[PDB]
Amino acid sequence: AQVINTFDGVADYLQTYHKLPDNYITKSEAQALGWVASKGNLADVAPGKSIGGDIFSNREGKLPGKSGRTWREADINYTSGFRNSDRILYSSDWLIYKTTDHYQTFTKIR
């Protein structure tokens, strides 16, 4: 009904509660409840939920980090319909980089 699922909003809840929202279950977690990765019925088998807390090895490489270091990704913006391409990337050093194109772009916020 009312949660935080945005770039600055999630960045705040991150540096605030130092932990993704209680409604941020990774994708495998949604599969546990019965979710098809088709990305066309996520909220259908697990409505009121978000995908976050997944490791970000940098499939591309655009975050302030190096080999040996690991980043963290979280779902940004999500309501109903097919998943979206907006997601944030927080690092162990609290480095938050938002991406509005699927890890295709990164902006340093918090």
73 is catalytic: yes
Nearest to 88 by CA among 102, 108, 74: 74
For residue 43, list its beta bridge partners.
none
The experimental method, as deposited, was NMR
SS (H, E, C) the chain: CCCCCCHHHHHHHHHHHCCCCCCECCHHHHHHCCCCCCCCCHHHHCCCCECEEEEECCCCCCCCCCCCCCEEEEECCCCCCCCCCCEEEEECCCCEEEECCCCCCCEECC
Walk me through the domains of the chain, giving residue ranges and CATH numbers: 1-110 (3.10.450.30)
- Calculate the alpha carbon distances from 8 to 86, 104, 109 in Å: 12, 18, 7
18 is catalytic: no
